[PDB]
Design a protein around this ligand. Structure first.
Ligand SMILES: Nc1ncnc2c1ncn2[C@@H]1O[C@H](COP(=O)(O)OP(=O)(O)CP(=O)(O)O)[C@@H](O)[C@H]1O
Ligand SMILES: [Zn+2]
Ligand SMILES: [Zn+2]
Length: 416
């Protein structure tokens, strides 16, 4: 880190005025400096809540050119376009349903960040070459780039990017430090001598706990409630993750027996609906969001104190991203799984519905790994971190591990 140059005054000024931060995080700066000043391909792995979006939003804003962001999650791109607009950064989603006037303005440099799907991107390389020649593309970002190894044939089409745009660096974002996924990303995207970075994965302010369902929803959730003389309330802002819309309706119906303010959050909700939930949750006009999806502005909030998984999670990478929505302000939060053996069998049936055998076998292994996490008598955090590091993490390596704030098993081993 000693070798890296510090950001200069213009760069920090830009960071403060358009993104509202006083300093870059260390790995953000490594990626940004590498892409912006060294023009190098990057594969970057960042913890939840670290700040991965800044890595591709900042460079084109600083130089006043175009950053191309490729993602399959259209609703999430819509959400990020709105957040950028609220910060006076012009951005748009570009697709086949977009108006000609937006495309006209993109060709004139009016938009700093252009979001597209891999499908649209693969059939419009001619447009991207015109943008490169007329305006200049600072970088191309591919998050969900693991999909190139949930596999998506749409991502393999991105292999033509480096042919059409040999001068444009690509930033690939992925969830784990797995070398096998990284090798597929480099191969499929044709990256050249990419810079590889990893923040590490620990969220030390997230306490981990697993407990058994008791047979009744209200009995399960009562420990997370406080009863003022006037009314019931959650201890703090809370997300309850459910495995289905049906379970969401069941959980929500029970919470409303106590007149608790909540909202639901599902895939397929409109832009307006997502904006309404974001507004009410951020302003604490609702105390709880019961969710079947783990991304989007509906659950983007700084002070989530409690995450509850109502039912056994199916895989440890989804679990990590779901609990990572908590504690973004750095203050103490708690993450509880409530599970029953019956969950595991329903989990087992949903994986038999996976057609592709290789993907189904991978998912079945991820479930077995999650089942071992739920049953463990050892440190929960050590198990999760080892999966993301793709190697056994030593307990002595982090000060949080083995303390009363680490996890239920660490706490119970100390309290007796
Ligand atoms: N240099 C910096 N200093 C302080 N906070 C920063 C920061 N860069 C980013 N952040 C904040 O860190 C948080 C994490 O941002 P990030 O881009 O990872 O959101 P995210 O993980 O939800 C992307 P996605 O929606 O794809 O999951 C945000 O609240 C962001 O404002
Ligand atoms: Zn340099
Ligand atoms: Zn522990």
């Amino acid at each position: 880190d000693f070798l890296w140059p510090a950001p200069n005054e213009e760069q920090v000024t830009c960071l403060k005025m358009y993104f509202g931060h006083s300093s870059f995080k260390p790995v953000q700066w490594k990626v940004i400096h590498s892409v912006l000043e060294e023009r190098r391909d990057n594969v970057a792995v960042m913890a939840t809540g670290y700040g991965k979006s800044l890595c591709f939003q900042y460079p084109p804003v600083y130089v006043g050119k175009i950053g191309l962001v490729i993602s399959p999650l259209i609703s999430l791109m819509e959400d990020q376009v709105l957040q950028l607009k609220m910060s006076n950064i012009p951005a748009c989603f570009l697709g086949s349903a977009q108006s000609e006037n937006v495309l006209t303005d993109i060709k004139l440099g009016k938009y700093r960040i252009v979001y597209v799907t891999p499908e649209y991107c693969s059939g419009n390389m001619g447009l991207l070459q015109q943008l490169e020649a007329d305006i200049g593309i600072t970088l191309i970002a591919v998050d969900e780039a693991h999909c190139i190894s949930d596999f998506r044939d749409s991502f393999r089409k991105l292999g033509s990017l480096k042919t059409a745009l040999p001068m444009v660096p690509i930033v690939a974002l992925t969830a784990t430090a797995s070398s096998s996924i990284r090798e597929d990303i480099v191969r499929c995207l044709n990256l050249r001598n990419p810079q590889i970075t990893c923040t590490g994965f620990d969220r030390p302010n997230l306490y981990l706990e697993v407990r058994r369902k008791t047979g009744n929803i209200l009995q399960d959730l009562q420990p997370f409630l406080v009863k003022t003389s006037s009314h019931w309330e959650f201890e703090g802002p809370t997300i309850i993750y459910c495995p289905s819309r049906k379970m969401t309706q069941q959980v929500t119906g029970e919470l409303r027996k106590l007149n608790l303010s909540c909202g639901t959050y599902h895939a397929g909700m409109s832009f307006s609906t997502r904006k309404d939930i974001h507004h009410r949750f951020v302003r604490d006009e609702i105390q709880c969001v019961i969710a079947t999806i783990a991304f989007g502005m509906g659950i983007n909030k700084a002070d989530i104190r409690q995450v509850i998984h109502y039912g056994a999670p199916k895989d440890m990478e989804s679990y990590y991203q779901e609990i990572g929505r908590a504690g973004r302000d750095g203050l103490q939060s708690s993450c509880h799984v409530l599970w029953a053996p019956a969950d595991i069998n329903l989990n087992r049936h949903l994986l038999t519905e996976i057609r592709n055998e290789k993907f189904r076998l991978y998912k079945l292994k991820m479930m077995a790994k999650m089942e071992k996490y739920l049953h463990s008598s050892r440190c929960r955090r050590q198990i999760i971190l080892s999966h993301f590091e793709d190697k056994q993490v030593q307990k002595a390596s982090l000060g949080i591990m083995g303390t009363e704030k680490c996890c239920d098993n660490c706490r119970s081993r100390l309290d007796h």
